[PDB]
Design a protein around this ligand. Structure first.
Ligand SMILES: O/N=C/c1nc(CCCCNc2c3c(nc4ccccc24)CCCC3)ccc1O
Ligand SMILES: O/N=C/c1nc(CCCCNc2c3c(nc4ccccc24)CCCC3)ccc1O
Ligand SMILES: O/N=C/c1nc(CCCCNc2c3c(nc4ccccc24)CCCC3)ccc1O
Ligand SMILES: O/N=C\c1nc(CCCCNc2c3c(nc4ccccc24)CCCC3)ccc1O
Ligand SMILES: *[C@@H]1O[C@H](CO)[C@@H](O)[C@H](O)[C@H]1NC(C)=O
Ligand SMILES: *[C@@H]1O[C@H](CO)[C@@H](O)[C@H](O)[C@H]1NC(C)=O
Ligand SMILES: *[C@@H]1O[C@H](CO)[C@@H](O)[C@H](O)[C@H]1NC(C)=O
Ligand SMILES: *[C@@H]1O[C@H](CO)[C@@H](O)[C@H](O)[C@H]1NC(C)=O
Ligand SMILES: [Cl-]
Lengths: 532, 532
C-alpha cells in the first residue's frame, strides 16, 4: 500500500489527494514531538513517544497558539495568513506530500513558515505543497513550531524556559525527517530547508547553529536572514520582556520558578492578549518573543560567527521582494491606508522614520531622514511614502540579508541571489504596496497553475520557472540545468556580486543589490549609533 | 583740472587712460592710511597724514607683502594672481577710475580683492576697472589691505597686535571713499562694495561689523561669505597660531610685548617663509592668519549675529561658480595634475576628503565619504575626482554661502542669487578643473570686451550682461532694469529660493541651489561633529 507507512514512532495512514488532473499522496498532521502542554509550556520539546495502531494522517493538524490579525475582517489579503485550523498548544505536527508512485531516494524540501516568530501556520492555503511536490517530483515537508511567548520566552539560566525552544521545535522536526523521510521516498542526505520572513531567518539560524547543521543539506532564504534586527534579542533583553510579561499579568516576580509557574497557570490567549505590551518602543517590524543569542543554540554573537566562518559551508539560494516594508507601514504607521494611495505628509514621514528605526538616537534619526529625503521635493507625499517604504524594507530585510550574503559567500560553496519584483495581476492589495513581503510565496508554491485562481499565462510560466529553480537547486545545489538552453542564473561571487530579477520578463543580471542604501544601513549607521 | 582733484588729505593728479577706442580718468596709488611699517606693523591703520603739493597718482602702488605662488612658474593661469609690482609693507593705497567727463554724484563700486586673506593685490590685470567704469558709467574704486601675518596676526588682549587690522584697513579705505569720493564725481550715499573669495567674505564681514555698516549702501559677494570655514578663527586659535609663528623664529614667548617686539624685528619674507607652518592640520583651503571673532569687530559669534539679525539690512547680490574646489585640489591633493585629466584612485580620494575636512573625526570623514561616493562604481576615477571637487566646492564656498543667504534673507531688504557656470573658451587650465574659483572675475571686469584677449562674441555679451547686472544692482538695489523686455532675474525669497544661471545661454531660473548636499554640510555634519 502506497498510503500506509511505518515510521520509527508508529504506523501512519495518509490520503490520496488530487493535483492538476493527477494525484499524489499526502500525510498530514504527523506528530513529531510530545505536546508542549501543562508543565512543558516553554520547555524544550521532547521526542514524540511511539504510538500503537495507525495514525490518521489525512487531516491538517491544529495551529499553534498565536495572535490572530483582525485588522481587516474577512479580507482575503490578510486572512490568508491567519490560522485556518483550531488553535492549541498541542501543535507540533508536520505534513508530507509524496509523489505517486513513490520515488526511490528523491530530493526533500522542508518548508518553515514565517509570521515574525509570533504567528504562522503550516496549513495555510498558500503553503499547499501538492503543486510543488507533484510538478518537480520532490518530497515536500511542512514543519511547524511554537511561536510567540510559548515558543520563545527566554529566561537565560532557567531550564524550564531557556529560550529558542521554537527553534528547537524545528530542529526536532528536521531530526524526525532525518530518521523517517526514507520511508516516504525521501533521501535524508538531500534535504533543502527553505522558509520565508521569520522562516528564512530560521533557515539562516540552522545554518549557524551547530546542533542543526547536520540535519539538512542546502538552504533557501526568502525575505529573511539570521541577522535581521527583528530576528533575535540579547539574553538581558529577553529576560526583561519575559519578566515584563509576568508583571503584565500580576505574576509574582521574585524568582524564575515562581514567574514561570504563574505564566504556566495562564490560558494561552491571556499571554497573547498582552504579548505586544513588552516591546521597548513604539515599533514597526518588531516582535516580542524571538530567538535569543544564548551561548548554546548560538555559540557566540551572530556577527563573530559570520566573521569566523563558524557555520555550515554549503550552497544557499536567497533573495528579497521589491517592497518588503509596505505591509508593515499599512498596519503600523500614520498616513497609510489600504483604501488610498497613502501619500504621506512630511510630518507623517518624520513619525514613520521614528517608528521604523526603534533604536536610533536623535543623530541616527537625522541620518536616516537625510538619507531618504529628496530636499528639492520634501513635501511630495508619494516620494515620502515610497521613501519610508524603502526605509523599512532596507533596514529590516534587504540590507540585513546582503550583509549575510556577503559574509557567507566568503566561506560558502555557492550562492544564488534573486530580486523578486513581480506584482501579481490578481493582487488584492493597493498598488502603492508594491511587491509585498510574502507574495512571492504563492509563485514558489505553484498556485498560479490553478486556472480558477485566474493568474495570467505568463504568471503560470513564472511560477514553473521559479519552482524548477528551487527544485533543481534543491537536487543539485545549482538552480540551473547546466548545458541546457535557458539563460543561466549566475553565481553570486565575492567580487562581482551578481543577482537576477525574478519576473515575467527575460532574465536580467545586475550587480550589487542596493549597495548605496545598504552601505548606510550596514556600515555607517551602526558606527553612528555606537558613537556617543 | 579734470585730472587734478583736491581731496581732504591733499591734491592728487591722475592720468588719462584709453579704453576701447575711448578714454577715461585713473587715479592710481592714492594713499588712504599711514604706512604700517616697523613699529606700526600688526597695529591698527592710522589715517594718512595730509600732504603738500600734488601726489603723482598715475602709476599702480606697491603690493602688500605676501606669499608668491611658484608652483607653475611663468604659467599664465597662476601668474595672473601674483603681485605685479614691488612688495612693501607700505602698501595701503587705493585706485579710482572715473568716466570722462566727470559725472555728478554717480554710483560707486569698491572692489575688495580675495586670496584667502594671505595674498592678493589691487593691481592685477583682471582687477583693471577702466572697462567696468567706462561701460557702466560708474566710479570704480579698488582698495588694498594687509594680508597674512601683517594683516591678521591676532594676540587678543593686546593693542599692539589685536587682529583684524586687515579688515580695518578695508574699513579705513571705505571711510576714505565716504569722505573723498564726492570730489571724484562719486556719490558716497550709493557705494557698493564687492569682492571675491576672501573679498566676498570681507564684504560679508562688513555687513555684520557695526563699525562698518555706514560706510557703504549695499553688497556683492562672489564665491565667499563671512561664515566660510576658512574665513575666521577664534581668539584662542589666533593666539595659538601667533605664538607658534613666534616659536618658528625662536622669538621670546614670555609675553605679547616680547613676542611682538621680536616679530617686528624680522624681515617680511622671514615671516612669510614660516607662515604656513602654523596650521593645526594638513589641510586644503585653509589659511594661517585670518580674521578673529574678537568681540569688537564682530560683537558676538557670526552665527548668533546672523540669528538675531545683528547686521546691516539692505540688498545683496551674490553667487558661486560651478567648480570652486578644482583649483585647491590641484595645488594640495594627491593624484591631481595640471597636465592630466587627474582620474583619482579610491586611495587618493580617501586622502582627498581627509585634507578637505581637516576638522573632522573619523565618523565625520565617513559621513562625507558616504555622501559623495557612488557605491555602484567606487573605482571610477572621474566620479572620484568630481566627487572630491564637489566636496571642496560645497564645503568651503557654496554651502557656507547658502547658509548665509538663507539667514540674511530673513532680515535683508532683497537678495539676488547667481550660479556662474560658463567655462571660458580661451581658458588655460585643463578641462577637468571646470568653472574655476575666481574665473568669473574676468567677466565682472569686462575683459571679454578686449578684442585682443580672444574671447568669443558670446562671452563679450555675457560680460556685458554681467557688468550691467552689477552696475544696475549697485545703482538701484535690483539687477533688473524695470521694463527691459529680456528675462528678469527673480528675487531670492525664504520660501521659493530662486536663483539664476550665468552662462552664454538664455537665463533659466532654479530653486534650492545644491540643497541636498548643503543640508548635509550646513545641518547634518555639524550636528554630527558636535555630537561625537
Ligand atoms: O501593526 N499593528 C499596529 C497596532 N495594532 C493594534 C490592534 C491589535 C491589538 C494589539 N496589537 C498590536 C500592538 C502592537 N503592534 C502590533 C503589530 C501587529 C499586530 C498587532 C499589534 C504594538 C503596541 C501594542 C499592541 C494595536 C496597536 C498597534 O500599534
Ligand atoms: O590649505 N591651503 C590652501 C590653498 N591655497 C591655494 C592658493 C594658491 C594660489 C592662489 N591663486 C589663485 C587665486 C584664485 N583663483 C585661482 C585659480 C587658479 C589658480 C590660482 C588661483 C582666486 C582668488 C585669488 C587667488 C591653493 C591651494 C590651497 O590648498
Ligand atoms: O596646498 N598645500 C600643499 C603644499 N604646497 C606646497 C608648495 C610649496 C610652498 C608652501 N606653501 C603652501 C602651503 C600650503 N598650501 C599652499 C597653497 C598654495 C600655495 C602654497 C601653499 C598648505 C600646507 C603648508 C604650505 C608645499 C607644501 C604643501 O603641503
Ligand atoms: O509590524 N508588526 C507586525 C505586523 N503584524 C500584523 C498582523 C499579522 C498579519 C501578517 N500577515 C502577513 C504576513 C506576510 N505578508 C503579508 C502581506 C500583506 C498582509 C499581511 C501579511 C508574510 C509573512 C507572514 C505574515 C500585520 C502587520 C504587521 O506589520
Ligand atoms: C481518517 O479521517 C478522515 C477524515 O474524517 C476520514 O475520511 C477517514 O475515514 C478516517 N480513516 C479512518 C480509518 O478512520
Ligand atoms: C565547492 O567545493 C568543491 C570541492 O570541495 C570545489 O571544487 C568547488 O569549486 C566549490 N564551489 C564553489 C562555488 O565554491
Ligand atoms: C610720477 O611723476 C610723473 C608725472 O608727473 C610720471 O611720469 C612718473 O612716471 C611718475 N613716477 C614714477 C617713478 O614713475
Ligand atoms: C524692504 O524691502 C521690501 C521689499 O524687499 C520693500 O517693502 C521696501 O523696499 C523695504 N521696506 C521698507 C519698510 O523700507
Ligand atoms: Cl604668549
Amino acid at each position: 500500500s502506497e498510503l500506509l507507512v511505518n515510521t520509527k514512532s508508529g504506523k501512519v495512514m495518509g490520503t490520496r489527494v488530487p493535483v492538476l488532473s493527477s494525484h499524489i499522496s499526502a500525510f498530514l498532521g504527523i506528530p513529531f514531538a510530545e505536546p508542549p502542554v501543562g508543565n512543558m509550556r516553554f520547555r524544550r520539546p521532547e521526542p514524540k513517544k511511539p504510538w500503537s495502531g495507525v495514525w490518521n494522517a489525512s487531516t491538517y493538524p491544529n495551529n499553534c497558539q498565536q495572535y490572530v490579525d483582525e485588522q481587516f475582517p474577512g479580507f482575503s489579503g490578510s486572512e490568508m495568513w491567519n490560522p485556518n485550523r483550531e488553535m492549541s498548544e498541542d501543535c507540533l505536527y508536520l505534513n508530507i506530500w509524496v509523489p505517486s508512485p513513490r520515488p526511490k531516494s528523491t530530493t526533500v524540501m522542508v518548508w518553515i513558515y514565517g509570521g515574525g516568530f509570533y504567528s504562522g501556520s503550516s496549513t495555510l492555503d498558500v503553503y499547499n505543497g501538492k503543486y510543488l511536490a507533484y510538478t518537480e517530483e520532490v518530497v515536500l515537508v511542512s514543519l511547524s513550531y511554537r511561536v510567540g511567548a510559548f515558543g520563545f520566552l527566554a529566561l537565560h539560566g532557567s531550564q524550564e524556559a531557556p529560550g529558542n525552544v521554537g527553534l528547537l521545535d524545528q530542529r526536532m522536526a528536521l531530526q524526525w525527517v532525518h530518521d523517517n523521510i526514507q520511508f516516504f521516498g525521501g533521501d535524508p542526505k538531500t534535504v533543502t530547508i527553505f522558509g520565508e520572513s521569520a522562516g528564512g531567518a530560521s533557515v539562516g539560524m540552522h545554518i549557524l547553529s551547530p546542533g542543526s547543521r547536520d540535519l539538512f543539506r542546502r538552504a533557501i532564504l526568502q525575505s529573511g536572514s539570521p541577522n535581521c534586527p527583528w530576528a533575535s534579542v540579547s539574553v538581558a533583553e529577553g529576560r526583561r520582556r519575559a519578566v515584563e510579561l509576568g508583571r503584565n499579568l500580576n505574576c509574582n516576580l521574585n524568582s524564575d520558578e515562581e514567574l514561570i509557574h504563574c505564566l504556566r497557570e495562564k490560558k494561552p490567549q491571556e499571554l497573547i492578549d498582552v504579548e505586544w505590551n513588552v516591546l521597548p518602543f513604539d515599533s514597526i517590524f518588531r516582535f516580542s518573543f524571538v530567538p535569543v543569542i544564548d551561548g548554546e543554540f548560538f555559540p557566540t554573537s551572530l556577527e563573530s560567527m559570520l566573521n569566523s566562518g563558524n557555520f555550515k559551508k554549503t550552497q544557499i539560494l536567497l533573495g528579497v521582494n521589491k517592497d518588503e516594508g509596505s505591509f508593515f507601514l499599512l498596519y503600523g504607521a500614520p498616513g497609510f491606508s489600504k483604501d488610498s494611495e497613502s501619500k504621506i505628509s512630511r510630518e507623517d514621514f518624520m513619525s514613520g522614520v521614528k517608528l521604523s528605526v526603534p533604536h536610533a538616537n536623535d543623530l541616527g534619526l537625522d541620518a536616516v531622514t537625510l538619507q531618504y529625503t529628496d530636499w528639492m521635493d520634501d513635501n511630495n507625499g508619494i516620494k515620502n511614502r515610497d521613501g519610508l517604504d524603502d526605509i523599512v524594507g532596507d533596514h529590516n530585510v534587504i540590507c540585513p540579508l546582503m550583509h549575510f550574503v556577503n559574509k557567507y559567500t566568503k566561506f560558502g560553496n555557492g550562492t544564488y541571489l534573486y530580486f523578486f519584483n513581480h506584482r501579481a495581476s490578481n493582487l488584492v492589495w493597493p498598488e502603492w504596496m508594491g511587491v509585498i513581503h510574502g507574495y512571492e510565496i504563492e509563485f514558489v508554491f505553484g498556485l498560479p497553475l490553478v486556472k480558477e485562481l485566474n493568474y495570467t499565462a505568463e504568471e503560470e510560466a513564472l511560477s514553473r520557472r521559479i519552482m524548477h529553480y528551487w527544485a533543481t537547486f534543491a537536487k543539485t545545489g545549482n538552480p540551473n540545468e547546466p548545458h541546457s538552453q535557458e539563460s543561466k542564473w549566475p553565481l553570486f561571487t565575492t567580487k562581482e556580486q551578481k543577482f537576477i530579477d525574478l519576473n515575467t520578463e527575460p532574465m536580467k543580471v545586475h550587480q550589487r543589490l542596493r549597495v548605496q542604501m545598504c552601505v548606510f544601513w550596514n556600515q555607517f549607521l551602526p558606527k553612528l549609533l555606537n558613537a556617543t
